[PDB]
Design a protein around this ligand. Structure first.
Ligand SMILES: COc1cc(C)c(S(=O)(=O)N[C@@H](CC(=O)O)C(=O)N[C@H](Cc2ccc(C(=N)N)cc2)C(=O)N2CCCCC2)c(C)c1C
Lengths: 27, 250, 10
């Protein structure tokens, strides 16, 4: 529903310090 | 968590601590999947060879936490258990196959900046994300080393490993309800879960809809962050029909 | 060692 969307990150369009490392692995 | 780093505030708002009442200590990790349901590893609750068999009144779950030992007034929420459900085919005698359990809370938990459910995968998100090389994220208040304890929630990102490589790293019989993750020794980076991280989530952020999905549960390993060894995780999607069944029923 | 939690939760 709103599962999996973090109030302090996705909901306010902020990224945490390492989520890009995951993205980069999803080739 | 070995060789990880401090989590940011609100980084893992589905993280749950399973806390023993007396003596007051950290049992395990767990995850928030709705306002009344928490997911964890069966072994966190039931492991007869070690005379572990907790009932509802033995435990509390603490939600919204960052610091490990602090009471986080006005932030964390502490919940009592209404009922525990363990997978009826959980194989504690052999290899912890189907290492999964649900806990229903006595009252719904108020969502907040610090408290929020993770998503469970459907077939397509698992086929799309559960690939060798793709990284997931593990969090917990568990040991920092195989052989102290963190002041705050720890985080580490680890690649999913090829099934034949997982199989060849251990004498334990691996099943389709498990996957393994971690770096190889030739990779140089790293990290692992460890004692006290058990039952916490392995999540991945879908690049399709930008949501976090829980693909795994911290299940087992042989030591922690040993070269040539890998952490093993309960395959959540694979056990999703049982999860569905319990929640629909109860 | 853990900080004590409010009585209510036990
Ligand atoms: C019945 O199946 C078992 C039973 C045991 C006794 C063990 S184990 O060798 O003791 N491994 C321990 C760790 C060890 O002593 O070397 C373990 O996995 N412990 C987990 C916690 C854990 C989880 C993951 C990791 C990691 N990724 N490095 C490390 C530790 C646990 O609490 N239990 C409860 C007791 C039964 C085993 C699982 C294992 C692997 C299996 C599959």
């Amino acid at each position: 529903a709103d599962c999996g969307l973090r109030p302090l990150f996705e909901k306010k369009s902020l990224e945490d310090k390492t989520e890009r490392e995951l993205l980069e692995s999803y080739i | 968590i070995v060789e990880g780093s401090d989590a940011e505030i609100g980084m893992s708002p589905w993280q749950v601590m399973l806390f023993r009442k007396s003596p007051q200590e950290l049992l395990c990790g767990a995850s928030l999947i709705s306002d009344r349901w928490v997911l964890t590893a069966a072994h966190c609750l039931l492991y007869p060879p070690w005379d572990k068999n907790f009932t509802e009144n033995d435990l509390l779950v603490r939600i919204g936490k960052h610091s490990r030992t602090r009471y986080e007034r006005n932030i964390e929420k502490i919940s009592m258990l209404e009922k525990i459900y363990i997978h009826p085919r959980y194989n504690w005698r052999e290899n912890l196959d189907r290492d999964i359990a649900l806990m229903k809370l006595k009252k719904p938990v108020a969502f907040s900046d610090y408290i929020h459910p993770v998503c469970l995968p459907d077939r397509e998100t698992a086929a799309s994300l559960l690939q060798a090389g793709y990284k997931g994220r593990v969090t917990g208040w568990g040991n920092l080393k195989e052989t102290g304890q963190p002041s705050v929630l720890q985080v580490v990102n680890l690649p999913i490993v090829e099934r034949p490589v997982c199989k060849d790293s251990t004498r334990i019989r691996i099943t389709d309800n498990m996957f393994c993750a971690g770096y190889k020794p030739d990779e140089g980076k790293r990290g692992d879960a460890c004692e006290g991280d058990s039952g916490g989530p392995f999540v991945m952020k879908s690049p399709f809809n930008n949501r976090w999905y829980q693909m795994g549960i911290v299940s087992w390993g042989e030591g922690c962050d040993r070269d040539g060894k890998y952490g093993f995780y309960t395959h959540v999607f694979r056990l999703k029909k049982w999860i569905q069944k319990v929640i629909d029923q109860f | 060692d853990f900080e004590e939690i409010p009585e209510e939760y036990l």
